Design a protein around this nucleic acid. Structure first.
Lengths: 87, 86, 86, 84, 84, 87, 86, 86
RNA sequence: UUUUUU
RNA sequence: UUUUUU
């Protein structure tokens, strides 16, 4: 298979009761995007210990794929591959 | 004032209980460019299991949020129950 | 006999389904220091999804419980519906 | 980050939360304990997460609308909590 | 169908079950109570289902590998259980 | 829309941890079937009070529809429209 | 002896966590007429969220039950993780 | 100090995730009348989905609890895995 | 089918 | 993301 796509951006929203949200992707494959793209993010894909969440606006890096949703994340970290911080 | 629009389901993930509506009319006027409106299963007017099916026509109230726009209450045309994809 | 108080929502977490009220009046007399009263979503008087918004004013019945106080029924001022923040 | 230590005051497994009696704040012993809210999601341990009344804990916390709210709770030395 | 009456012996809301002390079996008073298992799913009431220690109950039951196992539990007169 | 299809039969299996099972349909639209047809049944569709379940072999009547699953039930009762009995 | 077969996913309901495998080989021999084998998500060898995608090739162990036949452990070809439809 | 016993599964419900053991030996001495010991799925020594089958023989550590006895660790004879019945 | 997460 | 029901 082709290698998975990668990008970076920030959390648009994340609802912890729902257990999901969206990332605004502002860079893709190492190049800035003129127009940001929303990417779905589920709690199960967040790299961090304990309860998993993202804070609005928090910077993230991720791998993702195309789907019927548009685009969805496969694994999500903070900058530098650090754990996400969450709320 | 509560914001009102109409359109059709863009897509809906039945397992996760949410999707998006493509809004094609807002506040009584047609939109040339459709606008995505988030929709959660809990906001759907219908009996039994709540979901939407891609393409089904909807009328709804909504509000601005960090999601962009999100639904408050969603029905089919004329206030009919939504159909869904159970 | 149920105890009566009023105050405001201290906090409420909708994933948890509960929070605390800061009681600032008890049996009609004002308190200088607020008193914590537990509040479960199942006790909130309102339609739809039940929650409280931080700071919203509430009236309630409550009882003594092993570790403090727990509300039995919670309304807004005048017995109106709570407002919420889902 | 704020840190303290103490012991479980009480814990409610129906609702998934309790209180810690904080007896030291940032390494300074307190004459009287301070209440710290603790949700089950904060407890470092495998399986069903709870605290046993009186068990010793070490924790990070913050000021919030809850009062003092624990963020990550362990036993002594960073080891898992015991629970019931 | 077997029927009896009694009161809640104890109830565990973490695990969702308890025991009824059956003090009458098919309308006949018992010198000593008989244990009857009760799962939360059997309790006739709205909302969160539990029994309060000592609350009076009326119930159908059967013999099973549990011993005596309640099938539908109400309060006096077929009214809802009270719970905690 | 056309009226919903109806049939009768018996529970093939029902797993209460899963919350679902299958019905073996042996009559459809009031006529016996030479070859029985399996019809999915979810707990939410069982007409009865309290915890919802079917016992293996229990006789049922139901409305159903075609789906990607094959066929799935819309509402399930016992004989005569009586509540299901369950376990 | 544990029963072994191979085939492909017939269909799989991701929300409900189950489906059927169309078994086209059993105990080393080809089947002319495929045989339905129930499969639950809990029996799928793969990391992360467990499901199957319609048509994906599978190898599995199974047993007779009131379901007809049901899977005990399911992999892709050669023992590979299943692919799924998350 | 943990108490030791052996016996057999009285019943086990996999939706509940628990059951009871009938203890028929305590600290190596036989009992005429079996004694109930609660058993949670989380205490069962086996791979995969944890359960007990009615009548299967077990060995265990246990403790006194407020309403009876509760098992701490449960195995089959000789410390082998429990068998189960999912 | 003790998810205000059907 | 207190579902051995991810």
């Amino acid at each position: 298979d082709p290698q998975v796509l990668r990008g970076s951006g920030h959390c648009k929203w994340f609802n912890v009761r729902m257990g999901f949200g969206f990332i605004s992707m502002t860079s893709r494959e190492g190049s800035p995007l003129e127009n940001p793209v929303d990417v779905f993010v589920h709690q199960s894909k967040l790299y961090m210990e304990g309860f998993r969440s993202l804070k609005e606006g928090e910077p993230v890096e991720f791998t993702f794929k195309k789907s019927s949703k548009g685009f969805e994340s496969l694994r999500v970290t903070g900058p530098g591959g650090n754990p996400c911080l969450g709320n």
